[PDB]
């Protein structure tokens, strides 16, 4: 196979701190970011220009997602808070209390109206818009699914857990896992580590292959339907891979905290520690 390499096309500034999270709204008209400057910002995707900015977290913003079935935006931050924003009204409308520590990330179930959070308190929690216990350290990322097992978490205990109980726990990683990605066809997924990015088959989590080579602190993993997998790390390096073969076909304060494709999958957006969002397309 063959993927054209990606190039830098835009740099969007405006935050005043590390950009930790990024998400694209389902209509592909705007995207939303969160930063250590404690603000949530919404930008038009075509112009890159700032549309709106929301405040309400008192700590770093670590997770964002725009609902696929609502007019709502959800967010979780290091202040242990998890909020429901109505940007049509541009304000918080609900709180989700229950985590005992900083909340690192979230994902939405495709059609059950549930929100899933992952926190430093080593648990994931489900929220109607349960408590998933068993991990022995911070859960850095969580992915939600349609079929069983619907919940996938990556923890600082180096383990993957397929879930209000765990079905599968996979211990193959030698370092703590910090990023997990689902493949849009939902038969395979991948887990990020400093030692290796590992590929697993749903639903029981069967190890497929090791994707070696990205020797850094992997903060983010994202893939599009064409099979282009993206890994961003705290040193600012980014490794592009072919999903099926596992080939690393391109290698491009500094650091990458979140990456996100747009709905067209022709744009790749990065949340970086230099306080900017960088947009890449294919050359
Ligand atoms: Ni409250």
Experimental method: X-ray
The rounded Å distance from CA 2 to ligand 1 centre is: 50
Question: Distance (Å, rounded) from C-alpha 56 to C-alpha 158?
Answer: 33
CA of 74 to the centre of ligand 1 (A): 15
Domain-by-domain residue ranges, the chain? 15-282
Contacts of 184 (CB under 8 A, 6+ apart): 223, 224, 225
Q: Does residue 92 contact residue 85 with C-beta atoms inside 8 Å? A: yes
Residues with CB under 5 A from ligand 1 (ion): 95
CA of 127 to the centre of ligand 1 (A): 14
Name the DSSP class of 113. -
Ligand 1 center to 117 CA (angstroms): 16
What φ, ψ does residue 276 adopt, rounded to 5°? Answer: -125, 165
Query: How do beta strands 228-233 and 238-242 pair?
Result: antiparallel
The tokens describing 115, both together, are 């929100």
Do the beta carbons of residue 126 and residue 112 sit within 8 Å? Answer: no
Q: Which of 8, 44, 32, 45 is nearest to 264 (CA)?
A: 45
1 within 8 A of 242, measured Cβ to Cβ: yes
Cα 55 to middle of ligand 1, angstroms: 16
Centroid of ligand 1 to alpha carbon of 90 (angstroms): 17
Q: What is the experimental resolution, given in Å to one decimal place?
A: 2.6
Give the distance (Å) from ligand 1 centre to CA of residue 92: 10
Ligand 1 centroid to 69 CA: how many Å? 23
The CATH superfamily label for domain 15-282 reads: YVTN repeat-like/Quinoprotein amine dehydrogenase (2.130.10.10)
**Quick check: 237 and 1 in contact, CB under 8 A?**
no
Residue 99 Cα to ligand 1 middle (Å): 12
The alpha carbon of 95 and the centre of ligand 1 are apart by a number of angstroms equal to 5
The CA 80 to ligand 1 mean position distance, Å, reads 11
| Distance (Å, whole) CA 80 – CA 101 | 5
Closest CA to 180 of 6, 149, 56, 39: 149
For residue 251, cis peptide bond before it (omega within 30 degrees of 0): no
Q: How many CB atoms lie within 10 A of CB 132?
A: 22
Measured in angstroms, how far is the CA atom of residue 245 from the centroid of ligand 1?
48
- What is the CA(97)–ligand 1 centre distance, in A? 7
């Amino acid at each position: 196979q063959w993927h054209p390499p990606w190039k830098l096309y835009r740099v969007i500034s405006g935050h005043l701190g590390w950009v930790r999270c990024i998400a694209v709204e389902p209509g592909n008209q705007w995207f939303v970011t969160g930063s250590a400057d404690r603000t949530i910002k919404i930008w038009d995707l075509a112009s890159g220009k700032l549309k709106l900015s929301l405040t309400g977290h008192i700590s770093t913003v670590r997770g964002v997602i725009v609902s696929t079935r609502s007019p709502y935006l959800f967010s979780c931050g290091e202040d242990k808070q998890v909020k429901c924003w109505d940007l049509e009204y541009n304000k918080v409308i609900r709180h989700y209390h229950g985590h005992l520590s900083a909340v690192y990330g979230l994902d939405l179930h495709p059609t059950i109206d549930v929100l899933v959070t992952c926190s430093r308190d080593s648990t994931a929690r489900i929220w109607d818009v349960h408590t998933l216990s068993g991990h022995t350290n911070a859960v850095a990322t969580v992915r939600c699914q349609a079929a069983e097992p619907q919940i996938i978490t990556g923890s600082h205990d180096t383990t993957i857990r397929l879930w209000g109980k765990t079905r599968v726990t996979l211990t193959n990683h030698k370092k703590s896992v910090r990023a997990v990605v689902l493949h849009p066809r939902h038969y395979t997924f991948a887990s990020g580590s400093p030692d290796n990015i590992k590929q697993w088959k749903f639903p029981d989590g069967s190890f497929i292959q090791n994707l070696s080579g990205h020797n850094a602190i992997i903060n983010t993993l994202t893939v599009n339907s064409d099979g282009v997998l993206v890994s961003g790390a705290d040193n600012g390096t980014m490794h592009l891979w072919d999903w099926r073969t596992g080939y690393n076909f391109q290698r491009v304060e500094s650091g990458i905290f979140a990456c996100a494709f747009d709905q067209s999958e022709s744009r790749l957006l990065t949340a970086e520690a230099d306080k900017t969002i960088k947009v890449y397309r294919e050359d």
